[PDB]
């Protein structure tokens, strides 16, 4: 087509008469409509260098719409973006994210959105021009599709850049991004807003502020929405963002939704569902109540059955069961429902190989909770719990007894289990199982008493608690009492009766009560 | 916590030391019962870890003429048959 008028127009926008400028940009936006004349403006950096100035320095409305509208018509074409960038448009477009009119924002927030993706360098120049602050401030617009572009721009800038993740936090971010998920219904916006909340979660600086505003309770609203691209992102967020949600309510519906997700054909959902319940039941009293009231035992026991040896599923599942079976009103039922739903045999099998150690650390801790309700004393002995709990206790001692290593004794994690914890739990579990008399013949018969006595010197105050307690539960029978009184115990227990915690000044005194008396 | 409602063949024991309620926590039952043995003098003051109850109310509730102090479970289960838990 034709150019032959751009230098004529190059100076006409710079005319000091702010009325001719309106009568000048009125055709530039119109002449930018065709693909032909569009290439002319792009090849004239003297022309675009005047449109940018007329944007950041105008009092009219049609000029601001025609200018920022022209810059949008260039964004679809490649070399029309570099001209905007080499003319210093980014500091000007970010400005108009402040002036209040809707006609320019769809033209500005889009011209930035294309500039963030299809041209490099903008992801840095926008952060320097203070773009994140003006972008979060315009999250309260009544439009929904406009927010799908605005929230997506936040995802591009805060991706893997903890400088940007901290800016959105300081400028009131999480508390506003929740009132977007909690309100609107557009899938594209909710998919992006959840996609933003996740890369804000891994940074342990936004984790409480999202919880504090009300993120969990609102993200669970859309757990039933069809599009799976939105479902797992919400689950992925909660899993990373449930670490600091242990102390608030309103989750009443959130827990009666993850339980149903345990019976889903998607393994990557159950893994991101039991891990949530494992963290959301570590300290709260009434959270454990709500799980046991939605039938959470039966549904969670079945998960381990079909999980098999996949420890990534059983590790949070056993930890979740350990929480429900301890210290709350619904205790006698939570410890009973595992039996009635045929969960006792499989739990004992997890003690045996090939189960790794962090899962076993949680399973040997589950037995001490399952053994509170005395209706589980016989089935545990029937499934071979005593001879297997002793085996794990034997190695745990015959491995931390390798104090002979380098000058100072190297203690080795890596595997994740501090081997003093398996002794702290096994001898803590046997302390409960040694109430039923038939166990006290097996525990005795397995030649274990002269081993608790050597544990009784361990400087750990949690070993003495259970070792000097499991011996008290063995001290009833004289067949085991005056036998303990030979293999030590007479002297090491003599001055456990002045250790600090009043749980060891007793027990250790309860063993001496029956022994060398009459 | 834990609440149990005893059977009235036990309540006579607690109603003798000054009990007033009809249901009790296990801490309270083990308290009123320990006051009975101390008041009625049932221990053997020689070596005091033995309790006698040949022809006494405990000798009817429990069933054993002489039980030890720390036999635990039997005592725990001996008390757990004259009550009905609520």
């Amino acid at each position: 087509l034709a150019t032959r008028a751009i230098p004529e127009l190059t100076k006409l926008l710079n005319d000091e008469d702010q009325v001719v400028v309106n009568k000048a940009a009125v055709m530039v936006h119109q002449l930018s409509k065709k693909e032909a004349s569009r290439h002319a403006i792009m090849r004239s950096p003297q022309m675009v260098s005047a449109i940018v100035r007329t944007m950041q320095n105008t009092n009219d409305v049609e000029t601001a719409r025609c200018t920022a509208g022209t810059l949008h018509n260039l964004s679809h074409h490649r070399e029309g973006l570099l001209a905007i960038f080499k003319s210093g448009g980014i500091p000007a477009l970010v400005k108009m994210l402040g002036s209040p009119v809707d006609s320019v924002l769809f033209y500005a927030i889009t011209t930035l959105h294309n500039l963030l993706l299809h041209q490099e360098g903008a992801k840095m120049a926008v952060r320097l021009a203070g773009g994140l602050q003006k972008m979060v401030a315009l999250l309260n617009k009544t439009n929904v599709k406009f927010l799908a572009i605005t929230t997506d721009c936040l995802q591009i800038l805060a991706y893997g850049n903890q400088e940007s993740k901290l800016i959105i936090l300081a400028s009131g971010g999480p508390q506003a991004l929740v009132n977007i998920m909690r309100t609107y219904t557009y899938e594209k916006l909710l998919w992006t807003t959840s996609r933003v909340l996740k890369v804000l979660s891994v940074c342990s600086s936004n984790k409480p502020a999202i919880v504090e505003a009300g993120g969990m309770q609102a993200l669970g609203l859309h757990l039933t929405d069809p599009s799976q691209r939105l479902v797992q992102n919400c689950l992925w967020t909660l899993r990373n963002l449930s670490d600091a949600a242990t102390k608030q309510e309103g989750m009443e519906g959130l827990l009666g939704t993850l339980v149903q997700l345990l019976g889903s054909d998607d393994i990557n959902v159950v893994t991101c569902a039991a891990g949530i319940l494992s963290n959301l039941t570590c300290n709260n009293y009434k959270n454990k109540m709500m799980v046991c009231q939605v039938g959470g035992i039966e549904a969670l026991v079945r998960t381990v059955l079909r999980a098999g040896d996949r420890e990534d599923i059983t590790e949070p599942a056993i930890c979740a069961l350990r929480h429900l079976t301890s210290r709350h009103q619904e205790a006698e039922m939570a410890q009973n429902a595992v039996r009635l739903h045929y969960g006792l045999p499989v739990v004992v099998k997890l003690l045996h190989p090939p189960s790794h150690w962090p899962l076993i650390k949680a399973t040997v801790g589950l037995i001490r909770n399952l053994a509170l309700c005395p209706a589980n004393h016989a089935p545990l002995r029937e499934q071979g719990a005593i001879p297997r709990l002793v085996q794990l206790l034997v190695r745990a001692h015959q491995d931390t007894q390798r104090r002979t290593s380098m000058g100072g004794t190297q203690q080795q994690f890596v595997e994740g289990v501090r081997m003093e914890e398996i002794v702290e739990g096994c001898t803590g579990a046997l302390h409960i199982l040694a109430r039923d008399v038939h166990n006290r013949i097996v525990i005795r018969g397995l030649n274990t008493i002269p081993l608790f006595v050597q544990l009784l010197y361990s400087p750990i105050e949690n070993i003495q608690r259970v070792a000097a307690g499991v011996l008290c539960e063995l001290a009833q029978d004289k067949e085991a009492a005056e036998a303990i009184e030979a293999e030590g115990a007479t002297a090491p227990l003599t001055e456990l009766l002045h250790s600090r915690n009043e749980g060891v000044a007793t027990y250790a005194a309860a063993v001496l009560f029956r022994m060398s008396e009459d | 916590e834990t609440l149990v409602r005893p059977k009235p063949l036990l309540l006579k024991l607690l109603k003798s030391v000054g009990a007033q309620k009809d249901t009790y926590t296990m801490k309270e039952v083990l308290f009123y019962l320990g006051q009975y043995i101390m008041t009625k003098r049932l221990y053997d003051e020689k070596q005091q870890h033995i309790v006698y109850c040949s022809n006494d109310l405990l000798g009817d509730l429990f069933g054993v003429p002489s039980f030890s102090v720390k036999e635990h479970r039997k005592i725990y289960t001996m008390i757990y048959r004259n009550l009905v838990v609520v």
Binding site: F513 | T2, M38, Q48, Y76
Partner: peptide
Amino acid sequence: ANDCFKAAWQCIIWLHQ
């Protein structure tokens, strides 16, 4: 004559159940 009994029960009550 009465202390070795009292100190025994307030240890059997320790364990609750």
